[PDB]
Structure formats: structure tokens, C-alpha cells
Design a protein around this ligand. Structure first.
Ligand SMILES: C[As](C)(=O)[O-]
Length: 314
């Protein structure tokens, strides 16, 4: 039974560690070492997905950590995600079993619907011929079976707007435990934050450093003067300040890195805080969604506009 500090409580009663290692766009050749180093450094939460094409390499690192006695299975919170082409009820358990085979696990702590979007089994999502209308209640009922069987100890969604999340909550027997979404100082998700707090759904922040591959204007939010300024005042890195902001909002954060030193720095967000007067200044940062869902917004999609995909949250 995990402690209070450094965790949030899910609506299941389970505790989610408030920092996890992101593995989105982590190259299969280096993710193993990243996972091993992360857990060695004190991470107790790994965020994975079938779609990231690297769960086998994550699995090898978990196996190593367990065999070396660094951690036991019960010490880790492991998340994976259901891809768009496995939304049919018989395909949901097939996807989870494949994921569990790759991660070399018997259960997940959390399993998420990756997007509110559906495609034909084994199709390429880049082609409109692949598209199918979502049936989230149907897919969710299949997810509820995994919850009931203990194959996933919690179930949730990813990239659901407040509206879509609310609609699922109204329809579901088992409420979503988590909505995993882009959340960082440049996209603070105050509407979804408030909705989540009001309904008991956990907001988990992906891309908590914005877009490190970008220039300042294109999404490197760590170049915001306010963040730099606060970083200098508190003797921390801009990344640390961005992450701590999210922590103080009561979110979990999922910083992705394959650099051991960056992985270590990204965990140093607990033994200090941002003063209330400095925290207020985050309200001045320009708000722009960086992961806009372009791949599923087009004339052939159920979402003809970004406003439709995000129910106005853009
Ligand atoms: C962090 As993502 C774009 O795989 O939902």
C-alpha cells in the first residue's frame, strides 16, 4: 500500500506515482537502458503503448530490473494503450494480450483507449479507406471486462476532450480512472483540469515540456521568459519548473527522455516548490495546443475540424 507523498489517488483507490517515464518516440534501441536507468534513479511509473513499437524493449528492461531485485512487480505502475485498429470487442483483449506478452507482464496498472478514433483491424491510419466510426461504449464495455478480470487494474482514456470524457462517464459502469492528455505551461487544460477535479478522473500530462524538437515559437515552451525567470530564482532548470507546475496542479507528468542525466533531473520535482506568487504568473503564457490531431481531422473523418475533435478545446 503506497504512501501519500508523490502519488495521486485514482477513483479505484489505487495510487498512481505522479512522475512516470514517457516512452513515446523513444527509439527501441535505447528505451531499454532508459527504463532501467529511470527505475534505478527512483521512477516507479512507466508509460507505454503498442503504437510506440518499443514495448518488447521495455519488457526486457523490466525483466532485468525484477531479476536483479531492484524492484518487485508490485512496486511499479505500468500503463499501456489500445490502438485505433483494435476497438472491436473481440480485438480489445487480443491487443492487451499482445502488449502483456511484449512487456512480459501478467497485468497492467492502467490501460487507455489511445484516441477517440477507430480504424479497420490491421489497416494504415494514414489512409481514409481505413476509417470506421468510433463506438466508444462498445469498446469501453470490453475495457470493463479487462478491469473485472484484473488484467488491467484501472482503465481510462487518452486525448478525450472534457465533453467526450463526460459523455463516457455518463455511459459507463466503471468510470474512466484517467484521461491522459497534452498538458504543459503552453497548454494548461484548465477546463479539463476543472472537469476532472469535479468528477474524480485523474489528469495525466503527456508532453509536459511542450515540444523539445521545436523552436520557442513552435512549441519549446521552456524558452518562455517567465519559466526561465522562475528557474533562475529557484535554482532549478526550466524543465524542472515546467514539471513542478504540473505537479502543483495535482497532475501526474510523463516526461519522455532516453538521456540518463535528463531522466534523473526530471524526477527532481518533489523536495521544493514554486511559490504561489510565481505560480500565478503562468497565467500570462500564450496557450497553443501542440499535438492537434491532424492525422484524424480531414474531410473523410468523423472529425472534419479540430473544434469537432476537441469539442472546442483548441
Ligand atoms: C502521447 As500520444 C500523441 O501517444 O497520445
Amino acid at each position: 500500500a503506497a504512501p501519500m507523498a508523490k502519488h495521486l489517488v485514482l477513483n479505484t483507490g489505487a495510487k498512481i506515482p505522479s512522475v512516470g517515464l514517457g516512452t513515446w518516440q523513444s527509439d527501441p534501441g535505447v528505451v531499454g537502458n532508459a527504463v532501467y536507468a529511470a527505475v534505478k534513479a527512483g521512477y516507479r511509473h512507466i508509460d507505454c503503448a503498442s503504437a510506440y513499437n518499443n514495448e518488447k524493449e521495455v519488457g526486457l528492461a523490466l525483466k532485468k530490473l525484477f531479476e536483479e531485485g531492484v524492484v518487485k512487480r508490485a512496486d511499479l505502475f505500468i500503463t499501456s494503450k489500445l490502438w485505433c485498429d483494435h476497438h472491436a470487442p473481440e480485438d480489445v483483449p487480443e491487443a492487451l494480450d499482445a502488449t502483456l506478452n511484449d512487456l512480459q507482464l501478467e497485468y497492467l496498472d492502467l490501460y487507455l483507449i489511445h484516441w477517440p478514433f477507430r480504424t479497420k483491424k490491421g489497416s494504415s491510419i494514414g489512409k481514409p479507406e481505413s476509417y470506421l466510426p468510433p463506438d466508444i461504449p462498445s469498446t469501453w464495455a470490453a475495457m470493463e471486462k479487462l478491469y473485472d478480470s484484473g488484467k488491467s487494474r484501472a482503465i481510462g482514456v487518452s486525448n478525450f476532450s472534457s465533453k467526450k470524457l463526460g459523455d463516457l462517464l455518463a455511459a459507463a459502469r466503471v468510470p474512466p480512472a484517467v484521461d491522459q492528455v497534452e498538458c504543459h505551461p503552453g497548454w494548461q487544460q484548465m477546463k479539463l483540469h476543472n472537469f476532472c477535479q469535479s468528477t474524480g478522473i485523474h489528469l495525466s500530462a503527456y508532453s509536459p515540456l511542450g515540444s523539445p524538437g521545436s523552436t520557442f515559437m513552435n512549441g519549446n515552451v521552456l524558452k518562455e521568459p517567465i519559466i526561465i525567470s522562475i528557474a533562475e530564482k529557484l535554482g532549478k532548470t526550466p524543465a524542472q519548473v515546467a514539471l513542478r507546475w504540473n505537479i502543483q496542479m495535482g497532475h501526474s507528468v510523463l516526461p519522455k527522455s532516453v538521456s540518463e542525466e535528463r531522466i534523473k533531473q526530471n524526477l527532481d520535482v518533489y523536495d521544493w516548490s514554486i511559490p504561489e506568487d510565481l505560480l500565478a504568473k503562468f497565467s500570462e503564457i500564450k496557450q497553443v495546443r501542440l499535438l492537434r490531431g491532424n492525422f484524424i481531422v480531414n474531410p473523410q473523418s468523423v472529425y472534419k475540424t479540430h473544434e469537432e475533435l476537441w469539442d472546442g478545446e483548441i
